Design a protein around this ligand. Structure first.
Ligand SMILES: *[C@@H]1O[C@H](CO[C@@H]2O[C@@H](C)[C@@H](O)[C@@H](O)[C@@H]2O)[C@@H](O[C@@H]2O[C@H](CO)[C@@H](O)[C@H](O)[C@H]2NC(C)=O)[C@H](O)[C@H]1NC(C)=O
Ligand SMILES: *[C@@H]1O[C@H](CO)[C@@H](O)[C@H](O)[C@H]1NC(C)=O
Ligand SMILES: [Cl-]
Ligand SMILES: [K+]
Length: 199
C-alpha cells in the first residue's frame, strides 16, 4: 500500500497532513501549481517578505530561481517524503535533503554569479529590525560565489539542507524539479511516489 501520508500532502500549522487545493491569489505567479497547491485558498510568503536585494539589486536571472524556489517550498504537494516533524524555525514546513535536480542547481548557481550576498545560511542570522531582512553588522557583502563557491554549497547550504542536490537529472524520475510546464503534467509527482516507496 502506498504511503499516502507522504503523497499529495501539505503540512499545516497544526502539523497535520492536509490535501492541496486551488492555488491562492497571492501565489498567482507560481503558475505550475495553479491547479494543485499547498499554497491554496495572514500569509508568510517569501514572494515579498524576503529581501532578495540585501546586497544591492539582485540580477533578474538570479531572482527568477529564488521565485521558483519560493514557489516549490510554499506550493508543492510533492515534498512529503522529505517533510520533517519539527519546523518551528520555518514559516511553513521543514523539508530535509530534497533531491534537487542537477540542472536546477547548476543553472541556479550560474545565473546568480553576478549577484551579491553577505552570508551562506539564509535561514538564520538576519537583522529583521526594519520589518525585512538586512545583513547583520559584520556580514560583508561579496560576490555570490564567495559564499556559494560551488553549486553544491549553494543548493545544500543556502536554506540549511532543505535541498540535497542530486546526481540525477530532469527526466530521470528521481529528482525534484523547481519548475515545470504544467500542461505537460507535474513531473515531481512520480518522483515523490518513487521516494515514498523506497524510503
Ligand atoms: C540591526 O540593525 C540596526 C540598525 O537599523 C537601522 O535603523 C533602524 C532604526 C531601521 O531604520 C532599519 O531599517 C535600519 O537598517 C542596528 O541598530 C543599531 O544598534 C546599535 C546597538 O547595537 C545602536 O548603537 C545604534 O544606534 C543602532 N542604530 C540604529 C539606526 O538604530 C542593530 O545593531 C543591528 N543588529 C545587528 C546585529 O546587525
Ligand atoms: C548517481 O549515483 C547513484 C548511486 O551511486 C547511482 O545509482 C546512479 O546511477 C547515478 N546517477 C547517474 C550517474 O546519473
Ligand atoms: Cl522560513
Ligand atoms: K511539485
Amino acid at each position: 500500500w502506498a504511503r499516502t501520508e507522504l503523497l499529495n500532502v501539505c503540512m499545516n500549522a497544526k502539523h497535520h497532513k492536509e490535501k492541496p487545493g486551488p492555488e491562492d491569489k497571492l501565489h498567482e505567479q507560481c503558475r505550475p501549481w495553479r491547479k494543485n497547491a499547498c499554497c491554496s485558498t495572514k500569509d508568510v510568503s517569501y514572494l515579498y517578505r524576503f529581501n532578495w536585494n540585501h546586497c544591492g539589486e539582485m540580477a533578474p536571472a538570479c531572482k527568477r530561481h529564488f521565485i521558483q524556489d519560493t514557489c516549490l517550498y510554499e506550493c508543492s504537494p510533492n515534498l512529503g517524503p522529505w517533510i520533517q516533524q519539527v519546523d518551528q524555525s520555518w514559516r511553513k514546513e521543514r523539508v530535509l535533503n530534497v533531491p534537487l535536480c542537477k540542472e536546477d542547481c547548476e543553472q541556479w548557481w550560474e545565473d546568480c554569479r553576478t549577484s551579491y550576498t553577505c552570508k551562506s545560511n539564509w535561514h538564520k542570522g538576519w537583522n529583521w529590525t526594519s520589518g525585512f531582512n538586512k545583513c547583520a553588522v559584520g556580514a560583508a557583502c561579496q560576490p555570490f560565489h564567495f559564499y556559494f563557491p560551488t553549486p553544491t554549497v549553494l543548493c545544500n547550504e543556502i536554506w540549511t539542507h532543505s535541498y540535497k542536490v542530486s546526481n540525477y537529472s530532469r527526466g530521470s524520475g528521481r529528482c525534484i524539479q523547481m519548475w515545470f510546464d504544467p500542461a505537460q503534467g507535474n513531473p515531481n509527482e512520480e518522483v515523490a511516489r518513487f521516494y515514498a516507496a523506497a524510503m
